[PDB]
């Protein structure tokens, strides 16, 4: 979707000159002026977006989008408008206010690939502004034409840059949450999205995953319409991809899905997702590690038979590892994973947790400046003592917590300031210790 010049004299034009040319009654002079404008808006640094808007050029550019007889000016103005729309919400608004949406949607059917591609790009920028413009683009009927552009036997016959553009614009139509995209628009888009999720290009796969992650971020009903399409196995596969740009959105999508129902969570387990976590929980990239632990916490919050799966895959030692050493935010997710595990696990599963060495690292964290994680941890111990109570082992556990220095940190918290904390402590103290 890219261009040139007439460019000895279309480079570095002044805005007054551009206005002069566009105001001439000459289509060719307007074309030259529009290209000059595009070049100012397309330069490497500080494009004069506001100056162009103030000159009142948008309405002219929009009208040039409809000049089928001069494809070059359609393309140049489409590019100019695209770059104005790439700015602030206010700059994107000016483009919308000029009536650009229906004009760009009309250009989607252009016989010229580079022109329909620019139209796609522009709509991506407009929809990317947020919920309102996203939904306005949809109301103008952008989805059908966009989907038609991908209606081919094999995606591979499409120009690579062209396909990446369509995928990205489609993902923005699935983006944002207050409100989320119209249910029927999501249903209309899903089938094509599933197809892109199986394409071989790394950027198309990444953005496809991001779109899926957007769609799974919300009520269980939204998660269900995605899981229903049977994409989980594919998401699990991409979860093991070598490229971080693909793994990140794949893990996010998987993580959103396990925040749903036990039935929906069971789907990721059935697909074999847990076998990838030994690697995800030790990933060099700290964000992956964080999201992986976060995902584990929503799985340990599941059924006992699901917690057992976590056990069978040998993931408890990995949780003990993250709890012992990791970026603090990851350690916080681990604490949650542990408290959720102890909250719904069987006595045997909880005993196992202690046998893996969860106690010491858990106590060492009680010394963190984060009342939230502290509550979570004290809460975890309570659940663990309760398991040892049903075993008349409440004493062997007290020693352990005393051995590693736990008590010397719980009593100190007993004198905390947050009622939730000092109360929780005191209770544990007088109930299990001295």
């Amino acid at each position: 979707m890219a261009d040139i010049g007439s460019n000895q004299g279309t480079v570095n034009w002044s805005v007054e000159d551009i206005v002069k040319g566009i105001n001439s009654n000459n289509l060719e002079s307007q074309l030259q002026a529009t290209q000059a404008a595009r070049k100012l808006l397309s330069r490497e640094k500080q494009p004069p977006i506001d100056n162009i808007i103030r000159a009142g050029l948008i309405p002219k550019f929009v009208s040039f989008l409809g000049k089928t007889d001069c494809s070059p000016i359609q393309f140049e103005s489409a590019w100019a408008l695209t770059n104005i729309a790439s700015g602030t919400s206010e700059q994107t608004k000016a483009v919308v206010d000029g009536g650009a949406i229906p004009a760009f949607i009309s250009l989607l059917a252009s016989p010229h690939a580079h022109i329909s591609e620019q139209a796609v790009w522009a709509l991506g920028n407009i929809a990317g502004d947020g919920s309102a413009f996203r939904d306005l683009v949809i109301k103008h009927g952008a989805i059908d034409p966009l989907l038609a552009l991908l209606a081919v036997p094999d995606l591979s016959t499409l120009a690579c840059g062209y396909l990446r553009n369509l995928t990205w614009t489609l993902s923005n139509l699935c983006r944002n949450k207050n409100p989320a995209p119209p249910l029927d628009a999501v249903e209309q888009i899903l089938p094509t999205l599933v197809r892109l999720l199986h394409h071989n290009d790394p950027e198309v796969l990444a953005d496809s995953c991001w779109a899926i992650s957007y769609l799974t971020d919300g009520p269980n009903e939204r998660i269900e319409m995605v899981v229903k399409k049977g994409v989980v196995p594919q998401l699990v596969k991409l979860l093991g991809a070598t490229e971080l740009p693909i793994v990140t959105p794949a893990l996010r999508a998987i993580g959103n899905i396990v925040t749903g129902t036990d039935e929906q969570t069971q789907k990721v387990i059935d697909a074999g997702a847990l076998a990838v976590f030994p690697s995800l929980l030790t990933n060099p990239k700290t964000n992956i590690q964080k999201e992986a632990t976060w995902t584990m916490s929503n799985i340990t919050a599941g059924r006992q038979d699901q917690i057992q799966q976590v056990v069978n895959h040998g993931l408890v030692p990995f949780l003990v590892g993250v709890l012992s050493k990791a970026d603090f935010k990851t350690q916080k997710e681990a604490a949650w994973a542990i408290t959720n595990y102890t909250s719904g696990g069987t006595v045997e599963q909880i005993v196992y947790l202690v046998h893996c060495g969860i106690i010491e690292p858990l106590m060492n964290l009680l010394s963190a400046k984060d009342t939230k994680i502290i509550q979570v941890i004290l809460d975890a111990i309570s659940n663990i003592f309760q398991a040892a109570e049903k075993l008349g082992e409440t004493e062997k556990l007290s020693i352990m917590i005393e051995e590693c220095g736990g008590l010397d940190k719980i009593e100190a918290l007993q004198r905390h300031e947050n009622e939730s904390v000092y109360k929780a402590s005191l209770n544990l103290i007088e109930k299990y210790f001295s």
Partner: peptide
Amino acid sequence: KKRKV
């Protein structure tokens, strides 16, 4: 238990 983004 199940907490979201």
